[PDB]
Amino acid sequence: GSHMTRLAPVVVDVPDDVLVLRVIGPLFFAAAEGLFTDLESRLEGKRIVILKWDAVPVLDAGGLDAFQRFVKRLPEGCELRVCNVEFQPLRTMARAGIQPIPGRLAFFPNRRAAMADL
């Protein structure tokens, strides 16, 4: 692994219990596994985690599986917000029938919308 799929800091003013990151690179199984495992270690004291996926051009079957497991494992009281899902990952998740989950998983068109109740 060349660590080419990675979490990147976002410069924005947010409460201390909110984490905002970009995911840069494709979410193929192996890369997704490492990324979501890393993300899980950053969740202490976080009420909201926002992932901006503008730079995620592809999401494959195993990558989606990894995403679903990550969501399943989120701590109580921690909501994942995903924004800027690109065409291929969005079509992949649509075909798989991914749905939001109250208090756990929400999708938004952009960062503004994902942060509107902040």
Partner 1 sequence: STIEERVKKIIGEQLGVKQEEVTNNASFVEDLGADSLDTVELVMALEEEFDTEIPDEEAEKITTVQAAIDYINGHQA
Residues at the contact surface with ligand SXM, assessed by CB under 6 A = 84-85, 93-94, 97-100, 107-109
Distance CA 68, CA 79 (A): 13
CB 96 within 8 A of CB 67: no
Identity of the residue, 19 or 64, whose beta carbon is nearer to partner 1 in the bound complex: 64
Which structure tokens are listed for 85?
Answer: 């899902």
- Site size with partner 1, rule: CB under 8 A: 8
Q: Which is nearer to partner 1, 95 or 112 (CB)?
A: 95
Residues ≥6 apart with Cβ < 8 Å to 52: 10, 20, 21, 22, 23, 83, 84, 111, 114
Q: Hey, which residues between 48 and 107 contact partner 1 (CB under 8 A)?
A: 85, 87-88, 90-91, 94-95
With 0-12 CB in 10 A as exposed, 13-18 as middle and 19+ as buried, what is 8?
exposed
CB of 94 to partner 1, least distance (A): 5
Decide which of partner 1, ligand SXM, none touches 99; Cβ closer than 5 to 8 Å per partner kind: ligand SXM
Nearer to ligand SXM, 61 or 94 (CB): 94
Polymer length in residues for the chain: 118
- Residues lying near partner 1 in the complex (CB under 8 A) are found at 85, 87-88, 90-91, 94-95, 109
